[PDB]
Task: structure prediction
Amino acid sequence: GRLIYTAGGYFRQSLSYLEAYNPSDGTWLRLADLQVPRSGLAGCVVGGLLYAVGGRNNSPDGNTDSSALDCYNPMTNQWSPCAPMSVPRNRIGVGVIDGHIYAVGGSHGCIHHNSVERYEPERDEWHLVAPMLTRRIGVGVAVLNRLLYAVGGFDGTNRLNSAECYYPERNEWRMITAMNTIRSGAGVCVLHNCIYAAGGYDGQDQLNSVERYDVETETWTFVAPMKHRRSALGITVHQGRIYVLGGYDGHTFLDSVECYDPDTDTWSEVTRMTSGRSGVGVAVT
Amino acid sequence: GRLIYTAGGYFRQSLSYLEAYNPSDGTWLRLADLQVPRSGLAGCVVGGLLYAVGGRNNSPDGNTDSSALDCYNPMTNQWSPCAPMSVPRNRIGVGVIDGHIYAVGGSHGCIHHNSVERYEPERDEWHLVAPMLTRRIGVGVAVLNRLLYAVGGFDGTNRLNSAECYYPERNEWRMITAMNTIRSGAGVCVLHNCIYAAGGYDGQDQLNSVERYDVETETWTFVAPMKHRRSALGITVHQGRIYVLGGYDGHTFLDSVECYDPDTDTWSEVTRMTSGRSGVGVAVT
Amino acid sequence: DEETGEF
Ligand SMILES: [Cl-]
Ligand SMILES: [Cl-]
Ligand code: NA
Ligand code: NA
Result:
């Protein structure tokens, strides 16, 4: 019986919440708070532990982007600090390959990283890999065919529709067909053999459009849009459907949770979150 | 009858408001919104039009610095854009001489500008002039004796108390006497024949001290402090009084307007703004 | 954020 975790986020202030939705029984769990509040972090599950990577702490005491790597054991309900990254990364993107955590891009102050680094949970160590072709913050990361895909983002001057692809054996990045829309802070995930990009911000409006990538076709076709425009939404896949959680619609911080069914190319509202928020980290156990 | 315009500002995000206060009859008018919201923009009035200069658009999902010059016509209640400056300038300071707008310093990403440039409204054109000796953002600017004074600010590393001064005919800068207090984010104006520096931030706390400079003597000397500590405030001069509007006091964003009568060297709370905020642009027509 | 309070 598996769970969708949601960590941190933002509403008026960076948030501490760790809550967990049960897609079967439809219930929400209140688990141990994070120790530092954070928006724009990303989450992943490797080894039955949950990891919360980077982000930012907007408190009324000040700003500070995080290089933290925080690690939640769900049998003990306890967060413990693991080794921090080389560099704070707000609006970070994360993807796991072979139980190794790739921290892609993100921002530190004024700096917009193209640095990438890979955490080894075994040794509790972070090391850099080949930095990507484009500075990217607000990047969506998906893993498909043992390859790491960095979709869209913001480079410090423009928002992006370019995507690029990391080859871990080879340690190099090559560019791929760009998206139809430019999206910073979209939700990017893998479903079937497709890289999906839902939502985001193009320096202007929020987005409700959704496109998927097809490595055979090498094109980015559009699919059904979401009910709600969401930037800085949290995304994950569970039992053959995409789940998007909260975000900013330009006006309010959504508590809505939508579920995309690829069989019928439709979205539907499943349960809402307890409080609206944006910039959450999301993983499935 | 002359009005005190306030444009833009920031509370939770950068804002689009243009509101005017009538100091004689005590009423607030809500005028046409700015097309693009900004905070840390600068305001001035030249030949009947009101101009909004520079700033940054801090949205929950992204910041972008403005290079824009925006032009409000009180008789049409219409904004419309004018030729933009050579670079974006957040936490800009601005002063007018002979009907030409001088844009001094401010930030653009990691750049803390020392460049300054001069807009000729007859030609809708900007040209650069000699840069300051110091990178300054959150600068205060005032015109006195057909010279441009640039007071305090932040140079990317140190908050300043230094002040320098520009000679339009000669096109050169000169440092002048430094202030008693370090002041980044102060309000700066001239009233009678002195330059006042009100509030700001010194590296530890927001201030309420007001010190004033005197070309005769060539010294800064304090006067009555404000009731409320404030930094990133708006400032202008009307009849024979200083008016400070708004700001961040370390805890909340002020709606307080304070008026300074120098005949009596006392400040009083005149009106409050329709909602608290920081980083407005302010001008009088 | 300490001179302007922004995030
Ligand atoms: Cl620049
Ligand atoms: Cl700022
Ligand atoms: Na300011
Ligand atoms: Na500052």
In short: The domain at 1-285 of chain B is CATH 2.120.10.80 (Neuraminidase). Chain B has one domain: 1-285.
